[PDB]
Design an enzyme around this catalytic site. Structure first.
Site, PDB file in Angstrom:
ATOM      1  N   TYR A  79     -14.841  10.891 -18.605  1.00 32.17           N
ATOM      2  CA  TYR A  79     -14.978  10.791 -17.149  1.00 32.17           C
ATOM      3  C   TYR A  79     -16.442  11.032 -16.778  1.00 32.17           C
ATOM      4  O   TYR A  79     -16.987  12.077 -17.106  1.00 32.17           O
ATOM      5  CB  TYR A  79     -14.033  11.794 -16.477  1.00 32.17           C
ATOM      6  CG  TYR A  79     -13.927  11.676 -14.974  1.00 32.17           C
ATOM      7  CD1 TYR A  79     -13.178  10.653 -14.375  1.00 32.17           C
ATOM      8  CD2 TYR A  79     -14.562  12.605 -14.145  1.00 32.17           C
ATOM      9  CE1 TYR A  79     -13.082  10.560 -12.993  1.00 32.17           C
ATOM     10  CE2 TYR A  79     -14.464  12.528 -12.769  1.00 32.17           C
ATOM     11  CZ  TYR A  79     -13.724  11.517 -12.195  1.00 32.17           C
ATOM     12  OH  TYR A  79     -13.678  11.489 -10.826  1.00 32.17           O
ATOM     13  N   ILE A 120       0.843  -1.191   0.000  1.00 28.67           N
ATOM     14  CA  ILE A 120       0.000   0.000   0.000  1.00 28.67           C
ATOM     15  C   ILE A 120       0.880   1.243   0.000  1.00 28.67           C
ATOM     16  O   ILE A 120       1.922   1.265   0.655  1.00 28.67           O
ATOM     17  CB  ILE A 120      -1.004   0.014   1.177  1.00 28.67           C
ATOM     18  CG1 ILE A 120      -1.988   1.174   1.039  1.00 28.67           C
ATOM     19  CG2 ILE A 120      -0.288   0.087   2.524  1.00 28.67           C
ATOM     20  CD1 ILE A 120      -3.225   1.012   1.905  1.00 28.67           C
TER      21      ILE A 120
HETATM   22  C1  LIG Z   1      -9.995  11.127  -5.110  1.00 29.45           C
HETATM   23  C2  LIG Z   1      -9.232  10.230  -6.063  1.00 29.45           C
HETATM   24  C3  LIG Z   1      -8.668  10.768  -7.217  1.00 29.45           C
HETATM   25  C4  LIG Z   1      -7.945   9.983  -8.114  1.00 29.45           C
HETATM   26  N1  LIG Z   1      -7.420  10.543  -9.204  1.00 29.45           N
HETATM   27  C5  LIG Z   1      -6.720   9.840 -10.121  1.00 29.45           C
HETATM   28  C6  LIG Z   1      -6.136  10.473 -11.365  1.00 29.45           C
HETATM   29  O1  LIG Z   1      -6.308  11.721 -11.572  1.00 29.45           O
HETATM   30  N2  LIG Z   1      -5.437   9.660 -12.219  1.00 29.45           N
HETATM   31  C7  LIG Z   1      -5.261   8.332 -11.960  1.00 29.45           C
HETATM   32  O2  LIG Z   1      -4.621   7.580 -12.726  1.00 29.45           O
HETATM   33  N3  LIG Z   1      -5.802   7.725 -10.879  1.00 29.45           N
HETATM   34  C8  LIG Z   1      -6.506   8.389  -9.940  1.00 29.45           C
HETATM   35  N4  LIG Z   1      -7.036   7.751  -8.816  1.00 29.45           N
HETATM   36  C9  LIG Z   1      -6.794   6.306  -8.654  1.00 29.45           C
HETATM   37  C10 LIG Z   1      -5.515   6.080  -7.847  1.00 29.45           C
HETATM   38  O3  LIG Z   1      -5.144   7.244  -7.064  1.00 29.45           O
HETATM   39  C11 LIG Z   1      -4.351   5.699  -8.754  1.00 29.45           C
HETATM   40  O4  LIG Z   1      -4.647   4.446  -9.412  1.00 29.45           O
HETATM   41  C12 LIG Z   1      -2.989   5.714  -8.033  1.00 29.45           C
HETATM   42  O5  LIG Z   1      -1.960   5.251  -8.933  1.00 29.45           O
HETATM   43  C13 LIG Z   1      -2.887   4.837  -6.787  1.00 29.45           C
HETATM   44  O6  LIG Z   1      -1.912   5.426  -5.937  1.00 29.45           O
HETATM   45  P1  LIG Z   1      -1.647   4.861  -4.465  1.00 29.45           P
HETATM   46  O7  LIG Z   1      -0.200   5.148  -4.147  1.00 29.45           O
HETATM   47  O8  LIG Z   1      -2.768   5.309  -3.587  1.00 29.45           O
HETATM   48  O9  LIG Z   1      -1.721   3.276  -4.574  1.00 29.45           O
HETATM   49  P2  LIG Z   1      -2.596   2.357  -3.576  1.00 29.45           P
HETATM   50  O10 LIG Z   1      -4.021   2.823  -3.666  1.00 29.45           O
HETATM   51  O11 LIG Z   1      -1.945   2.441  -2.228  1.00 29.45           O
HETATM   52  O12 LIG Z   1      -2.344   0.892  -4.210  1.00 29.45           O
HETATM   53  C14 LIG Z   1      -2.847   0.648  -5.499  1.00 29.45           C
HETATM   54  C15 LIG Z   1      -2.435  -0.708  -6.005  1.00 29.45           C
HETATM   55  O13 LIG Z   1      -1.050  -0.678  -6.303  1.00 29.45           O
HETATM   56  C16 LIG Z   1      -0.361  -1.563  -5.398  1.00 29.45           C
HETATM   57  N5  LIG Z   1       0.890  -0.884  -4.958  1.00 29.45           N
HETATM   58  C17 LIG Z   1       1.001   0.272  -4.282  1.00 29.45           C
HETATM   59  N6  LIG Z   1       2.321   0.598  -4.091  1.00 29.45           N
HETATM   60  C18 LIG Z   1       3.038  -0.356  -4.668  1.00 29.45           C
HETATM   61  C19 LIG Z   1       4.457  -0.625  -4.824  1.00 29.45           C
HETATM   62  N7  LIG Z   1       5.319   0.247  -4.285  1.00 29.45           N
HETATM   63  N8  LIG Z   1       4.844  -1.752  -5.499  1.00 29.45           N
HETATM   64  C20 LIG Z   1       3.940  -2.622  -6.014  1.00 29.45           C
HETATM   65  N9  LIG Z   1       2.600  -2.430  -5.892  1.00 29.45           N
HETATM   66  C21 LIG Z   1       2.108  -1.336  -5.239  1.00 29.45           C
HETATM   67  C22 LIG Z   1      -1.357  -1.939  -4.288  1.00 29.45           C
HETATM   68  O14 LIG Z   1      -1.202  -3.275  -3.778  1.00 29.45           O
HETATM   69  C23 LIG Z   1      -2.679  -1.810  -4.993  1.00 29.45           C
HETATM   70  O15 LIG Z   1      -2.969  -3.021  -5.709  1.00 29.45           O
HETATM   71  C24 LIG Z   1      -7.771   8.527  -7.866  1.00 29.45           C
HETATM   72  C25 LIG Z   1      -8.351   7.990  -6.696  1.00 29.45           C
HETATM   73  C26 LIG Z   1      -9.069   8.781  -5.804  1.00 29.45           C
HETATM   74  C27 LIG Z   1      -9.669   8.146  -4.586  1.00 29.45           C
HETATM   75  C1  LIG Z   2     -16.882  12.302  -7.081  1.00 28.81           C
HETATM   76  C2  LIG Z   2     -17.632  10.990  -6.757  1.00 28.81           C
HETATM   77  C3  LIG Z   2     -16.787  10.180  -5.718  1.00 28.81           C
HETATM   78  C4  LIG Z   2     -15.598   9.413  -6.372  1.00 28.81           C
HETATM   79  O1  LIG Z   2     -15.836   8.427  -7.073  1.00 28.81           O
HETATM   80  N1  LIG Z   2     -14.342   9.886  -6.099  1.00 28.81           N
HETATM   81  C5  LIG Z   2     -13.055   9.272  -6.574  1.00 28.81           C
HETATM   82  C6  LIG Z   2     -12.398  10.011  -7.603  1.00 28.81           C
HETATM   83  C7  LIG Z   2     -12.351  11.408  -7.609  1.00 28.81           C
HETATM   84  C8  LIG Z   2     -11.691  12.062  -8.649  1.00 28.81           C
HETATM   85  C9  LIG Z   2     -11.095  11.372  -9.649  1.00 28.81           C
HETATM   86  N2  LIG Z   2     -10.412  11.770 -10.753  1.00 28.81           N
HETATM   87  C10 LIG Z   2     -10.027  10.678 -11.402  1.00 28.81           C
HETATM   88  O2  LIG Z   2      -9.386  10.634 -12.453  1.00 28.81           O
HETATM   89  N3  LIG Z   2     -10.468   9.620 -10.740  1.00 28.81           N
HETATM   90  C11 LIG Z   2     -11.134  10.028  -9.649  1.00 28.81           C
HETATM   91  C12 LIG Z   2     -11.754   9.349  -8.661  1.00 28.81           C
HETATM   92  C13 LIG Z   2     -19.013  11.282  -6.397  1.00 28.81           C
HETATM   93  C14 LIG Z   2     -20.007  11.306  -7.399  1.00 28.81           C
HETATM   94  F1  LIG Z   2     -19.765  11.054  -8.670  1.00 28.81           F
HETATM   95  C15 LIG Z   2     -21.328  11.599  -7.090  1.00 28.81           C
HETATM   96  C16 LIG Z   2     -21.732  11.888  -5.791  1.00 28.81           C
HETATM   97  C17 LIG Z   2     -20.780  11.882  -4.784  1.00 28.81           C
HETATM   98  C18 LIG Z   2     -19.443  11.588  -5.082  1.00 28.81           C
HETATM   99  F2  LIG Z   2     -18.663  11.614  -4.132  1.00 28.81           F
END
Ligand SMILES: Cc1cc2nc3c(=O)[nH]c(=O)nc-3n(C[C@H](O)[C@H](O)[C@H](O)COP(=O)(O)OP(=O)(O)OC[C@H]3O[C@@H](n4cnc5c(N)ncnc54)[C@H](O)[C@@H]3O)c2cc1C
Ligand SMILES: C[C@@H](CC(=O)NCc1ccc2[nH]c(=O)[nH]c2c1)c1c(F)cccc1F
Ligand SMILES: Cc1cc2nc3c(=O)[nH]c(=O)nc-3n(C[C@H](O)[C@H](O)[C@H](O)COP(=O)(O)OP(=O)(O)OC[C@H]3O[C@@H](n4cnc5c(N)ncnc54)[C@H](O)[C@@H]3O)c2cc1C
Ligand SMILES: C[C@@H](CC(=O)NCc1ccc2[nH]c(=O)[nH]c2c1)c1c(F)cccc1F
EC number: 2.5.1.26
Lengths: 540, 540
Positions: free
Chosen positions: A460, A141
């Site tokens: 998206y 993680i």
């Molecule tokens: C609010 C929000 C916004 C987001 N925006 C984006 C976006 O703009 N673009 C995008 O691509 N994604 C986005 N995501 C998805 C996510 O953030 C990405 O996929 C990101 O690469 C995961 O980063 P993390 O370090 O949190 O990995 P984690 O969530 O901690 O882990 C993800 C996976 O990778 C593995 N992993 C983590 N670290 C390592 C390591 N060092 N070696 C091997 N495996 C590992 C874990 O076991 C797990 O399977 C978003 C998610 C949220 C909740």
């Molecule tokens: C914005 C989402 C919540 C959500 O799925 N957040 C994760 C998230 C937020 C922003 C992101 N940009 C990316 O590229 N991937 C992303 C993933 C949401 C809704 F789409 C509708 C109502 C509440 C709500 F929280």
């Protein structure tokens, strides 16, 4: 900018983000954000309440099972560790809706048995060697931002699960000013990486919405995409080199050359591996001079269709700015409701960044192209407030949850000639499925085009509904999301552009990459990690 | 532009290129090229003879072993086939020096037993199914341009070897004007692909020096790089989709989206597979409008070192033109000797291509940057004649062979900070090794920088010597090329930038990609092709 060990002390244990940042009703009965952290923090939002009302029709621990001999050897390494409930619960989920419910309103079936915090590559080698010896299971993680059930522990996993936390293995090792690369440990956050590099006049420009918490190793693991990809590249473009620890041993190329022909590129064997092959410990990433200047912009269009045609043309001329994004009408209204024919009209937000002079050459070309699709320059403000908004959207999940509103964002990539039809049919599919499953109010389903490519675009989607008066609201959401994915695929969209597969999309993978292809992935997994130490069971 | 079945009828059986194109001494005793095919065809080269003299100090079949039951089934398919000596000899080599000697001056140990010409994907499925049943071995061929012993048949291979010739499986299947992609059969040549696309106003811009004969399937197999990569991308950038026939079955992604996150990218499992996993039958490639305008250019520098510093700076500002290349002094003199301080001075050739207006914005920025490293605009002519020359260089091998001169080109990629030292030390290593092995005149060893990247550059070396008075001249060449490779690697260069590994560089691969990485490749090979049908034995 470094994530601490006791995460709950800075971050929310039951939702997204920082503890100091929550939506609340202020002493005027207007929605406002706590704290001093973002631009919109401590700024009242008079129309936001009315908007939620109008849109939705509302008012407003298992015990730790660990071997004592392994624990004995672990103490000899001075690798910090924890068996505490609240640390293990924190590392058992990402930010998919169902996970967030089980967090707020109950308990997970399976969680990690012990958390470990290595601080360097050799520590990780020690942990993996220990997992071979005592038959352990490892789920890496970083930020814990997975939206694919990537971190969820399989419920029928009988072995001791280690949550291998990378957050403390986070230092920039060297900045190579000659080759414009930076060699970093995999645990570093985006925000911390950009902050440290800026002090030396550099950046990566890799800016996912999760950048405050998501790590380098995460990005490589999930094939992450960033907002400013048009300039800086996606992660597959940005990564020159990496070092990976697996049960079979350490993978690492012996040279740092920009482009090779030495058989199939084994970086692409790891990039997208979603934690199933090993631990990514170190990586060498491309850096750039801190951009001289930035400018925002916006354009309005008679309709979505004409906006897409304009984005297509921008792509065709290969003159897309740093960021270009096209909002449908419902999203335009949303963004208007958050400031301190108008029913089909769509708006594109723009962000130009680079050398002072070149930025303006670009700006002109974009607006001239936009003119020919009925695009009228719609202000520098619209643009700027549009981009500042993106790091607060994620906090609104928790707000909606208070007031009986659930929803999630989802994505795809598709060819240019399938975009318009895909968007329309996916939204329709959401409305129909909701009605059929007993939703009282028409569900919110909107979209925006977030990235352009030569061969197509990233799309998206947001979807949400008032679940008041529904028997089993999580099953309704779950089934509708799966229907949207079916519709996406049927309209020529991809299984994922950037969120990846994890365990959420496993069922579609064999169709997506073919059976032989699936078997190629399995053949690798079985060589590298024969006894499934890395057993999050993502992908395959 | 389509390669015929009886290749020897249009092409040289014992060397590079077209039969109608050979260097000879004209009736004035000047070197001249035959035919009307290239710009320099039929143009006398007065200084070229003198240059060769000054630089070098000279004056101037096994039987077909095939099962009759397999042959019976093959006749039922109307897939054309041949057991003829001259067809099988043609398909037993590429254009490495040793292969060309055995061709001219003797015989190969092993050659293909039968040649097949499938015309489509289904034909290829039939052949591979036939190879399973009758225990056959398959070595795919397109242009036969491999410079890595990629096509050489292992001498100890007891099974019937099929030369699976792709040349007749060569039609453009569709042109998608909406997505700017073209879906093509893998056997089409570059030259034929560009010609057909130009009739509709499009191109790919993928232009390797072998484009007259090298195929789409080849480029994917070897990770081919093209002259105008700076605009159009290398092959990994250009390929959106592919279809691959393997013993285990057919690999193919179910969608045509521009960018995906669905685990490790299985295109990169095939891309660079050098004919060891299967047959690439179809591929979808990016196209672009035919460029509005082209312009050539050149710049001279006091020395090589300052030229490299200028190319670095152009890379840093991300304003490289379509092509930018820096020749050392020996190569500048060479190019001067082919027209109809001046000992360290180096020259950069430039090619700008695109929209009429943007080409000039670019042009200015390049020259201004060059100014700061002592770079003086050195003429539109130098540039233009420099690039027309590249498709005739390959014909000079055969010229040199008449007059006791041997040599080969070789390449690497290296980081920016290792370029200058690598070039100097590799050339020195060639002089020393030659002297020690008994060469009379110090050899020719020159270099040029042919591609720039963010993280480094591609470096292209020539080396040649007068072998008159040497016991075993092929051993001397062989051993020196291997010493140059050692020197490259020791100076931080890569095993290959674009020629690939084949069987020429197998011994270094495990170092290059690490032992686990090598095992990952093997694990895939063994799943996809468990009985080694695709047994050219390249790579592993
Ligand atoms: C609010 C929000 C916004 C987001 N925006 C984006 C976006 O703009 N673009 C995008 O691509 N994604 C986005 N995501 C998805 C996510 O953030 C990405 O996929 C990101 O690469 C995961 O980063 P993390 O370090 O949190 O990995 P984690 O969530 O901690 O882990 C993800 C996976 O990778 C593995 N992993 C983590 N670290 C390592 C390591 N060092 N070696 C091997 N495996 C590992 C874990 O076991 C797990 O399977 C978003 C998610 C949220 C909740
Ligand atoms: C914005 C989402 C919540 C959500 O799925 N957040 C994760 C998230 C937020 C922003 C992101 N940009 C990316 O590229 N991937 C992303 C993933 C949401 C809704 F789409 C509708 C109502 C509440 C709500 F929280
Ligand atoms: C004069 C000359 C100039 C060159 N210039 C360049 C250059 O500018 N850039 C560059 O990158 N390279 C160059 N090369 C090297 C070579 O041309 C490339 O590697 C090219 O990609 C090979 O293409 P081809 O169709 O000739 O393949 P072949 O040489 O016919 O085959 C190459 C390998 O790929 C396999 N293969 C061929 N077709 C298929 C298929 N359909 N499916 C699966 N496997 C297949 C073969 O079995 C073999 O191992 C040059 C070579 C020469 C002789
Ligand atoms: C031009 C080479 C022969 C040679 O290396 N042919 C193969 C070849 C020719 C051109 C190439 N361009 C690339 O990118 N790769 C290439 C490979 C040569 C020498 F290096 C020395 C003496 C004669 C001679 F012909």
């Amino acid at each position: 900018g470094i994530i601490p060990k006791k995460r709950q002390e800075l971050m929310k244990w039951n939702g997204w983000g920082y503890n100091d940042s929550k939506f609340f009703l202020n002493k005027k009965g207007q929605l406002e954000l706590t704290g001093k952290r973002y631009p919109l923090s401590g700024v009242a939002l008079p129309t936001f309440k009315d908007w939620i009302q109008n849109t939705f029709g509302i008012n407003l621990t298992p015990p730790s099972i660990v071997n004592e001999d392994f624990l004995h050897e672990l103490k000899k390494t001075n690798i910090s560790y924890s068996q505490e409930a609240d640390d293990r619960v924190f590392r058992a989920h990402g930010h998919c809706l169902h996970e967030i419910f089980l967090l707020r309103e109950g308990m997970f079936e399976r969680i990690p048995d012990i958390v470990l915090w290595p601080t360097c590559h050799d520590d990780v080698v020690k942990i993996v060697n220990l997992a071979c010896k005592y038959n352990l299971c490892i789920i890496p993680i970083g930020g814990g931002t997975s939206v694919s059930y990537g971190l969820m522990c399989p419920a029928d996993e009988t072995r001791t699960i280690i949550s291998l936390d990378t957050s403390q293995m986070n230092r920039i090792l060297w900045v190579d000013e000659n080759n414009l690369t930076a060699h970093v440990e995999a645990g570093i956050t985006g925000q911390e990486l950009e902050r440290q590099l800026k002090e030396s006049g550099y950046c990566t420009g890799h800016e996912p919405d999760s950048l405050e918490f998501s790590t380098v190793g995460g990005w490589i693991s999930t094939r992450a995409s960033g907002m400013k990809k048009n300039i800086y590249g996606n992660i597959e473009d940005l990564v020159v080199h990496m070092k990976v620890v697996t049960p079979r041993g350490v993978i690492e190329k012996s040279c740092q050359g920009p482009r090779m022909s030495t058989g199939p590129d084994i970086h692409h064997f790891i990039m997208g591996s979603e934690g199933t092959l090993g631990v990514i410990t170190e990586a060498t990433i491309k850096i750039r001079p801190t951009p001289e200047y930035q400018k925002y912009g916006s354009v309005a269009f008679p309709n979505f269709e004409q906006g897409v045609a304009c984005l297509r043309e921008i792509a065709k001329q290969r003159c897309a700015p740093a960021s270009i994004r096209l909002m449908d009408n419902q999203q335009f209204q949303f963004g208007h409701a958050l400031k301190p024919d108008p029913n089909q009209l769509s708006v594109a937000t723009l962000l130009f960044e680079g050398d002072r002079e070149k930025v303006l050459q670009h700006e002109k070309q974009v607006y001239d192209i936009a003119a020919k699709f009925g695009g009228l320059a719609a202000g520098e403000d619209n643009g700027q407030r549009g981009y500042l908004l993106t790091y607060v959207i994620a906090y609104m999940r928790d707000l909606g949850l208070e007031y009986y509103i659930i929803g999630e964002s989802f994505e795809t990539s598709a060819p240019w000639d399938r975009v318009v039809d895909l968007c329309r049919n996916v939204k329709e599919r959401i409305r129909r499925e909701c009605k059929e499953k007993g939703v009282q109010f028409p569900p919110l389903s909107t979209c925006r085009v977030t990235q352009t490519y030569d061969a197509g675009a990233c799309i998206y989607f947001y979807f949400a509904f008032n679940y008041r008066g529904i028997s089993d609201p999580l099953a309704v959401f779950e089934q509708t999301e799966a229907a949207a994915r079916e519709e996406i695929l049927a309209n020529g969209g991809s299984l994922s552009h950037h969120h990846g597969v994890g365990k959420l999309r496993k069922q579609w993978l064999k169709e997506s990459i073919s059976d032989v292809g699936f078997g190629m992935l399995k053949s690798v997994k079985d060589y590298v990690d024969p006894t499934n130490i890395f057993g999050n069971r993502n992908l395959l």
